Tab-separated table of C-alpha atoms in Angstrom:
chain	number	residue	atom	x	y	z
A	26	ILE	CA	68.544	114.900	-45.802
A	27	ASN	CA	68.059	117.889	-48.090
A	28	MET	CA	67.585	117.135	-51.778
A	29	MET	CA	68.805	119.033	-54.842
A	30	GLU	CA	67.987	119.418	-58.524
A	31	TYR	CA	69.423	119.516	-62.048
A	32	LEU	CA	67.836	121.967	-64.497
A	33	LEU	CA	68.408	122.352	-68.238
A	34	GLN	CA	66.826	125.239	-70.160
A	35	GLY	CA	65.931	126.155	-73.717
A	36	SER	CA	63.321	127.547	-76.070
A	37	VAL	CA	62.044	125.695	-79.150
A	38	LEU	CA	59.456	126.911	-81.647
A	39	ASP	CA	56.293	124.828	-81.921
A	40	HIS	CA	56.450	124.215	-85.679
A	41	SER	CA	59.597	122.069	-85.393
A	42	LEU	CA	58.395	120.366	-82.191
A	43	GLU	CA	56.300	117.689	-83.938
A	44	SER	CA	59.345	115.621	-84.898
A	45	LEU	CA	60.862	115.881	-81.401
A	46	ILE	CA	57.925	114.175	-79.683
A	47	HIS	CA	58.337	111.385	-82.270
A	48	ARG	CA	61.609	110.607	-80.500
A	49	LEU	CA	59.901	110.751	-77.089
A	50	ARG	CA	57.656	107.799	-77.961
A	51	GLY	CA	60.495	106.121	-79.866
A	52	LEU	CA	62.879	105.477	-76.976
A	53	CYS	CA	60.826	105.632	-73.774
A	54	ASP	CA	58.072	103.223	-72.710
A	55	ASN	CA	54.372	103.383	-73.654
A	56	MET	CA	53.338	106.728	-72.194
A	57	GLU	CA	50.909	109.169	-73.806
A	58	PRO	CA	50.855	112.992	-73.755
A	59	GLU	CA	49.172	114.548	-70.722
A	60	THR	CA	48.845	118.342	-71.302
A	61	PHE	CA	48.648	119.253	-67.628
A	62	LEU	CA	47.727	122.793	-66.580
A	63	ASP	CA	48.745	124.423	-63.296
A	64	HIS	CA	48.201	127.744	-61.552
A	65	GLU	CA	51.396	129.317	-60.230
A	66	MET	CA	51.713	131.973	-57.527
A	67	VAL	CA	54.862	133.717	-56.272
A	68	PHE	CA	55.121	134.616	-52.583
A	69	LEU	CA	57.898	135.809	-50.291
A	70	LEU	CA	58.634	136.282	-46.590
A	71	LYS	CA	60.252	139.575	-45.558
A	72	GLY	CA	62.148	138.072	-42.632
A	73	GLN	CA	65.465	139.074	-41.103
A	74	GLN	CA	67.269	137.037	-43.779
A	75	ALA	CA	69.233	139.138	-46.268
A	76	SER	CA	67.702	137.297	-49.202
A	77	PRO	CA	63.895	137.275	-48.789
A	78	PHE	CA	62.327	133.865	-48.255
A	79	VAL	CA	60.865	133.791	-51.773
A	80	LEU	CA	58.975	130.719	-52.964
A	81	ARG	CA	56.606	129.603	-55.714
A	82	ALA	CA	53.379	127.698	-55.002
A	83	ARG	CA	51.571	125.588	-57.597
A	84	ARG	CA	48.036	124.223	-57.652
A	85	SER	CA	46.489	122.009	-60.349
A	86	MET	CA	42.887	123.083	-60.887
A	87	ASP	CA	42.295	120.355	-63.489
A	88	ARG	CA	43.101	117.393	-61.216
A	89	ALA	CA	41.361	116.724	-57.916
A	90	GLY	CA	43.403	115.407	-55.003
A	91	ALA	CA	46.535	117.434	-55.779
A	92	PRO	CA	46.807	120.105	-53.054
A	93	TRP	CA	48.771	123.351	-52.931
A	94	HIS	CA	52.489	122.618	-53.294
A	95	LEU	CA	55.085	125.151	-52.183
A	96	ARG	CA	58.560	125.146	-53.741
A	97	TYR	CA	61.259	127.188	-51.994
A	98	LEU	CA	64.342	127.226	-54.206
A	99	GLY	CA	67.755	128.611	-53.337
A	100	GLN	CA	70.307	130.892	-54.945
A	101	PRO	CA	72.252	129.840	-58.070
A	102	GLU	CA	75.337	127.742	-57.364
A	103	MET	CA	78.768	128.086	-59.001
A	104	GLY	CA	80.129	124.795	-57.669
A	105	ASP	CA	82.466	122.459	-59.538
A	106	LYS	CA	80.408	119.378	-58.630
A	107	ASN	CA	78.026	120.005	-61.558
A	108	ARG	CA	79.078	122.353	-64.361
A	109	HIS	CA	76.133	121.769	-66.712
A	110	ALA	CA	73.021	121.773	-64.491
A	111	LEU	CA	71.519	124.067	-61.879
A	112	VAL	CA	72.317	123.084	-58.285
A	113	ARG	CA	69.584	124.332	-55.954
A	114	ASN	CA	68.406	123.992	-52.360
A	115	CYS	CA	64.747	122.994	-52.192
A	116	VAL	CA	62.143	121.834	-49.686
A	117	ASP	CA	58.915	120.542	-51.246
A	118	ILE	CA	55.780	119.939	-49.140
A	119	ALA	CA	52.149	119.591	-50.256
A	120	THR	CA	49.434	121.065	-48.022
A	121	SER	CA	45.721	121.736	-48.433
A	122	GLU	CA	43.816	125.012	-48.992
A	123	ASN	CA	44.935	126.132	-45.507
A	124	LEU	CA	48.163	127.261	-47.241
A	125	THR	CA	47.020	130.485	-48.914
A	126	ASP	CA	45.170	132.011	-45.959
A	127	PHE	CA	48.039	131.046	-43.636
A	128	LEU	CA	50.485	132.807	-45.969
A	129	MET	CA	48.563	136.063	-45.489
A	130	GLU	CA	49.780	136.203	-41.869
A	131	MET	CA	53.489	136.761	-42.620
A	132	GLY	CA	52.894	139.153	-45.524
A	133	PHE	CA	53.360	136.854	-48.526
A	134	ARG	CA	52.238	139.071	-51.388
A	135	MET	CA	51.862	139.681	-55.143
A	136	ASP	CA	55.232	139.284	-56.879
A	137	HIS	CA	54.425	137.935	-60.372
A	138	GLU	CA	52.936	134.877	-62.078
A	139	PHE	CA	53.258	132.521	-65.029
A	140	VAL	CA	50.663	129.910	-66.019
A	141	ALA	CA	52.100	126.552	-67.106
A	142	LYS	CA	50.325	124.266	-69.583
A	143	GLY	CA	51.931	121.446	-71.530
A	144	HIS	CA	53.348	117.950	-71.765
A	145	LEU	CA	55.682	116.043	-69.458
A	146	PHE	CA	57.598	112.817	-70.074
A	147	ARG	CA	59.986	110.773	-67.972
A	148	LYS	CA	62.695	108.160	-68.344
A	149	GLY	CA	63.986	106.983	-64.981
A	150	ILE	CA	65.270	110.086	-63.207
A	151	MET	CA	65.106	112.569	-66.097
A	152	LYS	CA	61.832	114.476	-66.572
A	153	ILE	CA	61.571	116.505	-69.785
A	154	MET	CA	58.619	118.882	-69.934
A	155	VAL	CA	57.473	121.079	-72.822
A	156	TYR	CA	55.030	123.741	-71.691
A	157	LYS	CA	53.485	127.071	-72.642
A	158	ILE	CA	53.917	130.005	-70.267
A	159	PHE	CA	50.982	132.406	-70.016
A	160	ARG	CA	51.061	135.984	-68.731
A	161	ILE	CA	48.076	137.715	-67.143
A	162	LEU	CA	46.783	141.247	-67.595
A	163	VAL	CA	44.596	142.662	-64.817
A	164	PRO	CA	45.886	139.914	-62.468
A	165	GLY	CA	42.658	139.746	-60.452
A	166	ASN	CA	41.134	137.245	-62.883
A	167	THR	CA	42.533	134.098	-64.485
A	168	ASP	CA	40.707	134.335	-67.839
A	169	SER	CA	42.340	137.516	-69.218
A	170	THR	CA	45.622	135.763	-70.014
A	171	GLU	CA	47.774	135.490	-73.133
A	172	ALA	CA	50.792	133.596	-74.422
A	173	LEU	CA	53.904	135.008	-72.746
A	174	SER	CA	55.937	133.574	-75.645
A	175	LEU	CA	55.486	131.868	-78.999
A	176	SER	CA	58.522	129.590	-78.667
A	177	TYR	CA	57.897	126.720	-76.246
A	178	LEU	CA	60.064	127.049	-73.142
A	179	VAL	CA	61.364	123.491	-72.710
A	180	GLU	CA	62.907	122.289	-69.453
A	181	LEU	CA	64.628	119.130	-68.235
A	182	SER	CA	64.796	118.228	-64.543
A	183	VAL	CA	66.663	115.559	-62.592
A	184	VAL	CA	66.066	115.210	-58.844
A	185	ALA	CA	68.763	113.829	-56.551
A	186	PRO	CA	69.254	113.494	-52.776
A	187	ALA	CA	72.096	115.099	-50.830
A	188	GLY	CA	75.304	113.924	-52.454
A	189	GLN	CA	74.909	111.231	-55.127
A	190	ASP	CA	77.213	112.870	-57.662
A	191	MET	CA	78.702	111.692	-61.010
A	192	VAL	CA	75.516	112.258	-62.986
A	193	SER	CA	76.710	114.525	-65.840
A	194	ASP	CA	77.857	111.495	-67.846
A	195	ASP	CA	74.450	109.823	-68.242
A	196	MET	CA	72.463	112.991	-68.964
A	197	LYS	CA	74.996	114.065	-71.607
A	198	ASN	CA	75.043	110.597	-73.194
A	199	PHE	CA	71.241	110.486	-73.320
A	200	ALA	CA	71.171	114.034	-74.738
A	201	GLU	CA	73.634	113.001	-77.480
A	202	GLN	CA	70.696	111.147	-79.040
A	203	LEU	CA	68.922	114.531	-79.292
A	204	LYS	CA	71.798	116.984	-79.866
A	205	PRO	CA	70.902	117.765	-83.549
A	206	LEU	CA	67.349	118.535	-82.352
A	207	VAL	CA	67.952	120.369	-79.054
A	208	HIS	CA	70.858	122.276	-77.484
A	209	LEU	CA	70.382	122.262	-73.721
A	210	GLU	CA	72.293	124.753	-71.596
A	211	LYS	CA	72.944	125.816	-68.001
A	212	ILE	CA	71.827	129.459	-68.016
A	213	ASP	CA	71.952	131.756	-65.003
A	214	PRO	CA	68.592	132.866	-63.542
A	215	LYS	CA	69.814	136.473	-63.759
A	216	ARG	CA	70.662	138.558	-66.911
B	28	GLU	CA	48.481	92.007	-65.597
B	29	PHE	CA	51.771	91.346	-63.808
B	30	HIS	CA	53.360	93.056	-66.803
B	31	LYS	CA	50.922	95.957	-66.405
B	32	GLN	CA	52.487	97.537	-63.308
B	33	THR	CA	55.674	97.541	-65.389
B	34	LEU	CA	53.705	99.056	-68.292
B	35	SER	CA	50.783	101.183	-67.032
B	36	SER	CA	50.763	104.869	-66.046
B	37	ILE	CA	49.632	104.728	-62.400
B	38	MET	CA	53.226	105.318	-61.263
B	39	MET	CA	53.469	108.414	-63.506
B	40	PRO	CA	51.176	110.927	-61.769
B	41	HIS	CA	50.316	114.294	-63.279
B	42	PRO	CA	52.140	116.832	-61.006
B	43	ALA	CA	55.761	117.849	-61.341
B	44	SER	CA	56.032	117.793	-57.547
B	45	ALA	CA	54.824	114.155	-57.492
B	46	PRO	CA	57.258	112.179	-59.696
B	47	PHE	CA	56.089	108.633	-58.954
B	48	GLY	CA	54.041	106.560	-56.526
B	49	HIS	CA	50.462	105.579	-55.765
B	50	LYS	CA	47.509	107.892	-55.175
B	51	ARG	CA	46.591	106.320	-51.820
B	52	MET	CA	50.090	106.724	-50.379
B	53	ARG	CA	50.082	110.313	-51.663
B	54	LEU	CA	46.777	110.858	-49.842
B	55	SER	CA	48.231	109.242	-46.701
B	56	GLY	CA	50.674	112.130	-46.240
B	57	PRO	CA	48.269	115.031	-45.629
B	58	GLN	CA	45.191	112.867	-44.985
B	59	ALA	CA	46.641	110.198	-42.714
B	60	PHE	CA	45.013	106.825	-43.339
B	61	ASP	CA	43.703	104.614	-40.552
B	62	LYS	CA	45.740	101.601	-39.442
B	63	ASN	CA	43.426	99.320	-41.420
B	64	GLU	CA	43.773	101.596	-44.453
B	65	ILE	CA	47.583	101.586	-44.225
B	66	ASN	CA	47.901	97.810	-44.564
B	67	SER	CA	44.795	97.148	-46.679
B	68	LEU	CA	46.135	98.880	-49.794
B	69	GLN	CA	49.488	97.085	-49.806
B	70	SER	CA	49.324	93.598	-51.313
B	71	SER	CA	52.252	91.242	-52.018
B	72	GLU	CA	50.630	87.899	-52.836
B	73	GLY	CA	52.325	84.956	-54.514
B	74	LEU	CA	50.797	83.356	-57.585
B	75	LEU	CA	50.661	79.814	-56.187
B	76	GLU	CA	48.538	80.749	-53.166
B	77	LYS	CA	45.971	82.294	-55.511
B	78	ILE	CA	46.188	79.190	-57.714
B	79	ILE	CA	45.587	76.789	-54.834
B	80	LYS	CA	42.782	79.023	-53.539
B	81	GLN	CA	41.097	78.824	-56.952
C	24	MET	CA	37.768	109.702	-36.329
C	25	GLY	CA	35.593	108.002	-33.746
C	26	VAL	CA	34.008	109.903	-30.872
C	27	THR	CA	36.455	110.121	-27.963
C	28	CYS	CA	36.138	111.068	-24.291
C	29	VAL	CA	39.334	112.165	-22.516
C	30	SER	CA	39.720	112.875	-18.795
C	31	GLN	CA	41.858	112.570	-15.682
C	32	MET	CA	41.323	110.614	-12.506
C	33	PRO	CA	43.843	110.961	-9.661
C	34	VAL	CA	45.453	108.443	-7.305
C	35	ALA	CA	42.141	108.739	-5.374
C	36	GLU	CA	43.551	107.810	-1.912
C	37	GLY	CA	44.412	104.280	-3.025
C	38	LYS	CA	48.120	103.336	-2.949
C	39	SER	CA	49.797	104.860	-6.013
C	40	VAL	CA	49.192	106.128	-9.556
C	41	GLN	CA	49.166	102.695	-11.201
C	42	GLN	CA	47.108	100.863	-8.545
C	43	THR	CA	43.839	102.343	-9.820
C	44	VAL	CA	45.067	101.661	-13.369
C	45	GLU	CA	45.530	97.990	-12.462
C	46	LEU	CA	42.087	98.011	-10.817
C	47	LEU	CA	40.588	99.283	-14.077
C	48	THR	CA	42.481	96.662	-16.105
C	49	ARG	CA	41.356	93.812	-13.850
C	50	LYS	CA	37.797	95.160	-14.051
C	51	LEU	CA	38.134	95.106	-17.846
C	52	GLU	CA	39.470	91.537	-17.652
C	53	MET	CA	36.409	90.670	-15.573
C	54	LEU	CA	34.538	92.024	-18.582
C	55	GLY	CA	37.153	90.274	-20.720
C	56	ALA	CA	38.618	92.744	-23.219
C	57	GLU	CA	41.577	91.803	-25.411
C	58	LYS	CA	44.505	94.121	-26.095
C	59	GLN	CA	45.736	95.699	-29.323
C	60	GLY	CA	49.111	96.981	-28.074
C	61	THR	CA	50.329	100.175	-26.420
C	62	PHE	CA	50.010	103.922	-27.006
C	63	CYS	CA	51.747	107.141	-26.029
C	64	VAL	CA	51.051	110.807	-26.753
C	65	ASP	CA	54.044	113.160	-26.457
C	66	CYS	CA	53.980	116.960	-26.548
C	67	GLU	CA	56.556	119.714	-27.115
C	68	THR	CA	56.108	123.477	-27.202
C	69	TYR	CA	57.833	126.171	-29.266
C	70	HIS	CA	57.585	129.958	-29.243
C	71	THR	CA	58.883	132.999	-31.118
C	72	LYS	CA	53.357	132.632	-30.452
C	73	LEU	CA	53.135	129.246	-28.740
C	74	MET	CA	53.782	126.458	-31.272
C	75	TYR	CA	52.518	123.051	-30.163
C	76	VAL	CA	54.612	120.712	-32.319
C	77	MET	CA	53.325	117.421	-31.061
C	78	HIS	CA	53.029	113.713	-31.847
C	79	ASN	CA	50.951	110.590	-31.208
C	80	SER	CA	52.030	106.948	-31.421
C	81	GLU	CA	48.676	105.886	-32.889
C	82	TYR	CA	49.513	107.792	-36.085
C	83	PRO	CA	53.299	108.380	-36.146
C	84	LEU	CA	53.126	109.968	-39.608
C	85	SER	CA	50.683	112.558	-38.224
C	86	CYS	CA	52.896	115.403	-37.004
C	87	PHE	CA	50.507	117.860	-35.352
C	88	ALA	CA	51.446	121.554	-35.448
C	89	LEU	CA	49.094	123.897	-33.616
C	90	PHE	CA	49.006	127.508	-32.504
C	91	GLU	CA	47.902	128.340	-29.017
C	92	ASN	CA	44.366	128.456	-30.465
C	93	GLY	CA	44.549	128.729	-34.272
C	94	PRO	CA	44.619	126.231	-37.135
C	95	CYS	CA	46.170	122.776	-36.869
C	96	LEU	CA	48.496	121.257	-39.482
C	97	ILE	CA	48.446	117.451	-39.389
C	98	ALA	CA	51.512	117.371	-41.597
C	99	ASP	CA	54.041	114.872	-42.930
C	100	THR	CA	57.761	114.279	-42.414
C	101	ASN	CA	59.021	116.987	-44.810
C	102	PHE	CA	57.230	119.635	-42.743
C	103	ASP	CA	59.461	118.553	-39.857
C	104	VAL	CA	62.443	118.987	-42.197
C	105	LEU	CA	61.306	122.523	-43.044
C	106	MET	CA	60.627	123.352	-39.374
C	107	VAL	CA	64.339	123.138	-38.444
C	108	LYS	CA	65.387	125.850	-40.913
C	109	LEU	CA	63.893	128.851	-39.085
C	110	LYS	CA	65.382	128.726	-35.542
C	111	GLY	CA	65.047	132.507	-35.116
C	112	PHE	CA	61.396	132.966	-35.974
C	113	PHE	CA	60.406	130.107	-33.657
C	114	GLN	CA	62.669	129.176	-30.735
C	115	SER	CA	63.027	125.603	-29.438
C	116	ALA	CA	61.450	126.175	-25.967
C	117	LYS	CA	62.610	122.877	-24.479
C	118	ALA	CA	61.480	120.892	-21.403
C	119	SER	CA	57.887	120.237	-22.483
C	120	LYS	CA	57.796	116.420	-22.256
C	121	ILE	CA	54.278	116.030	-20.903
C	122	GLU	CA	53.261	112.568	-22.104
C	123	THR	CA	50.523	109.981	-21.663
C	124	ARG	CA	51.726	106.371	-21.793
C	125	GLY	CA	49.628	103.229	-21.586
C	126	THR	CA	47.911	100.339	-23.354
C	127	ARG	CA	44.968	99.864	-25.698
C	128	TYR	CA	42.172	97.329	-25.277
C	129	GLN	CA	39.444	95.983	-27.561
C	130	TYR	CA	35.973	94.653	-26.731
C	131	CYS	CA	33.741	93.968	-29.782
C	132	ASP	CA	35.063	96.874	-31.895
C	133	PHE	CA	35.230	99.020	-28.748
C	134	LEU	CA	38.619	100.579	-28.077
C	135	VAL	CA	40.140	101.898	-24.840
C	136	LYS	CA	43.412	103.814	-24.491
C	137	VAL	CA	44.195	103.759	-20.765
C	138	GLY	CA	47.425	104.713	-19.046
C	139	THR	CA	49.312	107.098	-16.804
C	140	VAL	CA	50.475	110.687	-17.272
C	141	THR	CA	54.136	111.606	-16.855
C	142	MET	CA	56.174	114.803	-17.006
C	143	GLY	CA	58.931	112.891	-18.733
C	144	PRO	CA	60.280	110.357	-16.232
C	145	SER	CA	57.997	111.158	-13.287
C	146	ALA	CA	54.379	109.963	-13.452
C	147	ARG	CA	51.884	112.339	-11.808
C	148	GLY	CA	48.500	111.356	-13.218
C	149	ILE	CA	46.246	108.833	-14.922
C	150	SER	CA	44.876	109.437	-18.425
C	151	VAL	CA	41.443	107.912	-19.134
C	152	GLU	CA	40.301	107.756	-22.759
C	153	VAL	CA	37.321	105.891	-24.201
C	154	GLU	CA	36.352	105.688	-27.856
C	155	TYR	CA	34.369	103.732	-30.428
C	156	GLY	CA	35.324	102.809	-33.978
C	157	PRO	CA	32.325	103.365	-36.282
C	158	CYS	CA	31.339	106.685	-34.683
C	159	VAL	CA	31.376	108.705	-37.904
C	160	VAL	CA	29.160	111.685	-37.037
C	161	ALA	CA	29.840	113.556	-33.800
C	162	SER	CA	27.444	114.439	-30.938
C	163	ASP	CA	25.095	111.560	-31.833
C	164	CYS	CA	26.506	108.651	-29.783
C	165	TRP	CA	27.266	110.281	-26.428
C	166	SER	CA	24.739	108.063	-24.627
C	167	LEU	CA	26.810	105.026	-25.665
C	168	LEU	CA	30.056	106.528	-24.357
C	169	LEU	CA	28.343	107.696	-21.157
C	170	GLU	CA	27.021	104.166	-20.563
C	171	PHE	CA	30.502	102.790	-21.234
C	172	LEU	CA	32.006	105.292	-18.787
C	173	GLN	CA	29.581	104.412	-15.996
C	174	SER	CA	29.994	100.697	-16.778
C	175	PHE	CA	33.510	100.266	-15.373
C	176	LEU	CA	34.923	103.571	-14.067
C	177	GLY	CA	32.485	103.839	-11.180
C	178	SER	CA	33.871	106.921	-9.480
C	179	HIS	CA	35.406	109.776	-11.518
C	180	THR	CA	32.997	109.243	-14.423
C	181	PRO	CA	33.450	112.221	-16.784
C	182	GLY	CA	31.137	113.913	-19.252
C	183	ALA	CA	30.598	116.811	-21.675
C	184	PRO	CA	33.969	117.057	-23.466
C	185	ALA	CA	35.330	120.419	-24.594
C	186	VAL	CA	35.183	119.539	-28.310
C	187	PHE	CA	31.520	118.565	-27.895
C	188	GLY	CA	30.919	122.299	-27.532
C	189	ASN	CA	32.372	122.605	-31.050
C	190	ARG	CA	29.060	121.445	-32.466
C	191	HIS	CA	28.974	120.343	-36.099
C	192	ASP	CA	27.192	117.589	-38.005
C	193	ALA	CA	30.160	116.446	-40.124
C	194	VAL	CA	32.498	113.497	-39.548
C	195	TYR	CA	34.346	113.475	-36.229
C	196	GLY	CA	38.001	114.250	-36.814
C	197	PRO	CA	41.222	113.097	-35.153
C	198	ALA	CA	41.906	116.783	-34.524
C	199	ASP	CA	38.979	116.793	-32.062
C	200	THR	CA	40.414	113.909	-30.061
C	201	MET	CA	43.844	115.520	-30.403
C	202	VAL	CA	42.440	118.813	-29.123
C	203	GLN	CA	41.041	116.901	-26.162
C	204	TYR	CA	44.547	115.540	-25.518
C	205	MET	CA	46.132	118.996	-25.427
C	206	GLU	CA	43.338	120.233	-23.149
C	207	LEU	CA	44.169	117.217	-20.986
C	208	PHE	CA	47.817	118.325	-21.001
C	209	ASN	CA	46.748	121.822	-19.962
C	210	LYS	CA	44.721	120.274	-17.120
C	211	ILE	CA	47.673	118.220	-15.838
C	212	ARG	CA	50.518	120.735	-16.362
C	213	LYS	CA	49.065	123.175	-13.813
C	214	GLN	CA	49.192	120.897	-10.764
C	215	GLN	CA	52.571	119.270	-11.592
C	216	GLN	CA	53.190	117.738	-8.134
C-alpha cells in the first residue's frame, strides 16, 4: 500500500532551545544527540503530467552505507481526515550512486537546495527534528554556504500506512506537555 | 544485555528515511544478501539452551 | 557471485525435452549429488525503450530492472511499487513469460541449477547452468568449470560465456550470471517452436 505522513512546522530561536532539549531527555528513553548532516538536491521530471514530477533527493556524506534516497511528495491536502497535520503522497526508495547519472537522462535539473544539519529524536511514531538550514552561493561548490536562517526551523513527523486514522488525539496530548514551549501548526507549503 | 536491545541505539539509525531497523537488513535491500547471510544474522535463541550448552 | 556458465542443449533426437534432463540427473546420481531444492527464472518485458523487469527465485527480493543494454537496477520491493505509477511512460508489453524451471543440486560445495525452458506453459528447451560457490574473482577458475562441464554433459559441452568477454579482476557479480540468463532467453526466444 501507499504510505502517508504527518508534518508539524515551526521556527524557534536557538537561545531558548537549551531548555527544550532538557525535556527531550526527560521523557523519552536514553538517547543522545546526533547532529546529522545531509546534502539535499531538488530534481523534477517534465513529463506529460500537469504538475511536474518534482522530488527531493538526500545523501548523507558523513555516514557510510546510507545511499541516495529520493523522496517524491505530493500536493497539499485539504481533507477532513486530519485537520492539524500535512497529508502527503510519498514513495521512498534508497538507491546507490547510479541515481544521479540516471536522473540526467530525463532532464532532472537545478531547482534549488537547502543543507540540513541538526538533531533528531524519536518516541514511538513521532520524530521531532531540530535542524539548521543552509543556503549556498555559487551553487557549484558545497563550501561557500551560509545560514539560511538564525531561528532553528523545527519539524515533527509521523509516518503512517494507508488508512490508520484517529491519530490527532495522541499527538495533541503529547504536545500538551510542550505547549508553553512550542506552538506547532499546520501551515500550507504555499504563501 | 537482554535489556540492551530495549535500551541501545542500534534501532535508531541516523537517516530520516530510515526510522528503525538493523544495518544488515538495510543493506539487504539494495545489496541483496546470500541465502546463508539472510539466516545467519537472525538469531532467536532461548536462555536455557545456552545454559545447558555452557 | 560465483562464476556461472549458462547454455542450452536441445532434445538431441532422444525422446522428449525432459528425457535428456532425467539422463543428466541419473548421471549426477551416479556421481551422487544431493539436492538443495528448486529454482525458476521468470522474465517480463516493458517498453515506452525495452524495459526488462525480471525476477529470479534464488533471490526473490532481487527485482532486476534492465534496459535493452544499459544499467541494471537490482532493486527492492518499493521500486516495484513506484513502477506501477507511470503507465504512460512505460507500457506493460505483456506476454513475455519466458521462464527456466528446474532443480538445484549440491556436490561438495558445487552447485548445479538444471531444468527445462518454457514459454509459459509450453516447454521448448533445456537450460543448463553450472556454478561454484567460493569463486570470488572472475575469469580465474574457468578450467574448473570446463572440467565440470566435460565431466557429465558429454555432448553439448559449452564454453566461453558472453560475460567472460566483460573482463575485469573484481568480484564476480550476480548481474553477470543474470546477464547470462537474459542472453539465454534471447537465444531461446528466436526459435520458439
